[PDB]
């Protein structure tokens, strides 16, 4: 059965598709940026850190 | 009153007989004469006449004109703000359209007959379609929006006026009539719902303001939005109070929702004119709610806040127009370094933006205090809701100011002598109202 529903221009698909390539603003570079998600970690008491920071006589 | 009405009828008349080269000078002199006549009307208005200061009739119920507290303030505001619009507009066609719009609006405020009110306010329908849809700088979409919204709301108001004229036999405000009908109340209300932008019927306003000339935007925000409060105080609350009390939870929901959604929408705006337009929509909600409470504190507060908006919004729209003339841009992203490049424009912009945020030395503060007091008189939660959400206005205004304030700019874009002359009356009026001469 033909109905208005068939010929109404329903908004089911985007008329305009945004350009894929997008501008990313320049930012100062942080060499090491991995986020720390663990409050208690073995890294804090690492042997390297103890020798480099905790141990040297000051 | 008679002098004011005569000057109003003379201003459109004068254009027909001018030289076509003296048009701007004659129009400015006529605008100042209309302002002086409004001052005379204020002088001849005795406070002893508590109900209506002056009523004049010229042979029929339609030609019944009169001034009350709301009418007096709005008429003085229109006469004060029209000279600025006149100087900002160039060309006989533009002058003719503007002068006809002003005459129709100023006659509507003082009208005391619903049918005459409709006849005068809606006469300026094609003129706005033509003005907002001008050849190069106008948008047909905005013109269609404003025109259709106005026609539908005013037609509903007209149907309600026809029923009141049939049932009571008269539609003049001076004759005391009361109605409990909800269809008639809704008919009168829908006009107020659309004219004073209230969500979801506010879409027409921003489009019209953005694509209108600076004179048009100044007139629209300054006084066209206020015409709703005259209709409420003069043509709705006297007859349809019962329906406003019956629907108060719904009225409050729609007004608060308008205030919230408009504030949130203002945050996504990148055009200065759209920012000012959405600020106006947010500000209209408090006025509408305060008047709907049907209390002394609310009616006075709503009128006062309306005057404060009618003094602060034209200033922002004028500064935005001046900036656009200097730079041909309204995008906040392109405009930077305005503090260093335009110290004089920037000072006035910051002052007006502070006024828009309802700071104490501005009329907005006193007006807001009174309106909030009226809401608190109704319920404490009503006041709290409005007070809390006011921070959203701060966020958008602060972000805009910060983006405009600093950066790198290679263009000196500052106001000329003409631009300072145009805002000086608005600055002085803002200061005077701020110090308490409301």
């Amino acid at each position: 059965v033909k109905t208005l529903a068939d010929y109404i221009h329903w908004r089911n698909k985007p008329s305009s598709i945004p350009p894929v390539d997008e501008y990313r603003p320049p930012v100062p570079l942080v060499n090491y940026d991995k986020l720390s998600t663990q409050f208690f970690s073995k890294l804090d008491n690492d042997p390297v850190i103890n020798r480099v920071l905790r141990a040297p006589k000051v | 009153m008679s002098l004011y009405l005569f000057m109003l009828f003379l201003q459109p008349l004068s254009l027909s007989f001018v030289s076509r080269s003296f048009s701007k000078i004659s129009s400015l002199m006529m605008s100042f004469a209309t302002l002086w006549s409004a001052v005379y009307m204020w002088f001849t208005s005795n406070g002893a006449n508590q109900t209506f200061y002056q009523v004049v009739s010229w042979g029929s119920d339609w030609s019944t004109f009169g001034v009350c507290y709301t009418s007096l303030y709005i008429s003085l505001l229109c006469a004060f703000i029209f000279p600025i619009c006149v100087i900002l507009v160039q060309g006989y066609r533009a002058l003719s359209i503007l002068i006809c719009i002003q005459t129709a609006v100023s006659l509507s405020i003082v009208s005391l007959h619903m049918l005459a009110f409709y006849a005068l306010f809606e006469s300026s329908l094609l003129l706005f379609f033509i003005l907002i849809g001008r050849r190069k700088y106008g948008s047909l979409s905005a013109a269609y929006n404003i025109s259709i919204y106005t026609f539908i709301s005013a037609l509903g108001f007209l149907i309600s006026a026809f029923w009141l004229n049939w049932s009571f036999g008269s539609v003049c405000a001076l004759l005391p009539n009361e109605e409990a009908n909800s269809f008639v109340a809704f008919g009168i209300f829908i006009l107020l719902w659309v004219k004073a932008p209230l969500v979801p019927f506010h879409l027409w306003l921003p489009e019209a303001h953005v694509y209108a000339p600076t004179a048009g935007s100044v007139l629209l925000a300054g006084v066209l939005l206020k015409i709703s409060i005259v209709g409420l105080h003069v043509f709705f609350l006297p007859i349809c109070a019962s329906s406003i009390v019956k629907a108060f939870p719904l009225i409050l929901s729609i007004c608060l929702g308008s205030f919230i959604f408009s504030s949130f929408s203002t945050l996504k705006q990148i055009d200065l004119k759209k920012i000012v337009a959405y600020s106006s929509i947010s500000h209209m909600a408090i006025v509408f709610l305060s008047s709907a409470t049907n209390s002394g504190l609310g009616i006075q507060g709503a009128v006062l806040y309306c005057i404060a908006h009618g003094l602060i919004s034209p200033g922002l729209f004028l500064l935005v127009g001046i900036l656009y003339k200097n730079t041909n841009t309204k995008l906040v992203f392109y405009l930077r370094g305005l503090s260093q490049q335009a110290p004089v424009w920037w000072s006035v912009w910051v002052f007006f933006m502070l006024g828009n945020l309802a700071f104490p030395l501005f009329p907005n503060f006193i007006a807001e205090v009174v309106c909030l007091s009226a809401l608190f008189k109704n319920h404490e939660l009503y006041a709290y809701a409005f007070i809390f959400f006011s921070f959203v206005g701060t966020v958008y205004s602060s972000t805009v100011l910060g983006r405009l304030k600093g950066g790198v700019s290679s263009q000196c874009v500052d106001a000329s002598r003409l631009d300072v002359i145009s805002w000086n009356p608005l600055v002085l009026a803002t200061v005077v109202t701020g110090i308490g001469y409301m």
């Binding site: 945004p18 350009p19 390539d21 997008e22 501008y23 990313r24 603003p25 320049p26 930012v27 100062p28 942080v30 090491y32 940026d33 991995k34 986020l35 720390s36 998600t37 663990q38 409050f39 208690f40 | 996504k268 990148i270 930077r336 370094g337 404490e380 972000t399 910060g402 983006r403 600093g406 950066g407 790198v408 700019s409």
Partner: protein
């Protein structure tokens, strides 16, 4: 030299802009910043929200331990080794009126129950 220092200018946009580019604040100087720092991009100290929450979870109990004892575990009689300051009857009656007063905790007084109910007053105005 406070004035006249060299600055780097942000490069002009050269690619299609993202829809939500309004989240970036750029005045024309090279280091642009988000509207709110930490909303996106590099996080200060490389600490995520999860790390901060775990810290607050470790800290909160230690900070709350002093307050919970006196407020909840302790009682008016046992909180302090003395009674509240003693006043003449005329002064005491007026002072007892204040909800935020310090004379309402006098257990020795024969009006203790009324004073205690006064202290735990109404949440909101009844009218």
């Amino acid at each position: 030299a406070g004035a006249g220092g060299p600055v780097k200018l942000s490069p002009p946009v050269d690619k299609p802009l993202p829809y939500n580019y309004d989240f970036w604040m750029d005045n024309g100087i090279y280091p642009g910043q988000p509207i709110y720092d930490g909303m996106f991009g590099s996080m200060v100290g490389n600490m995520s929200l999860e790390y901060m929450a775990k810290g607050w979870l470790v800290l909160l109990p230690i900070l709350s331990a002093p307050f919970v004892y006196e407020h909840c575990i302790a009682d008016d009689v046992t909180r302090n080794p003395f009674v509240p300051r003693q006043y003449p009857s005329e002064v005491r009656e007026f002072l007892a009126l204040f909800k935020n007063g310090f004379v309402l905790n006098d257990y020795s007084q024969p009006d203790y129950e009324e004073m205690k109910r006064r202290q735990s007053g109404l949440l909101t105005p009844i009218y």
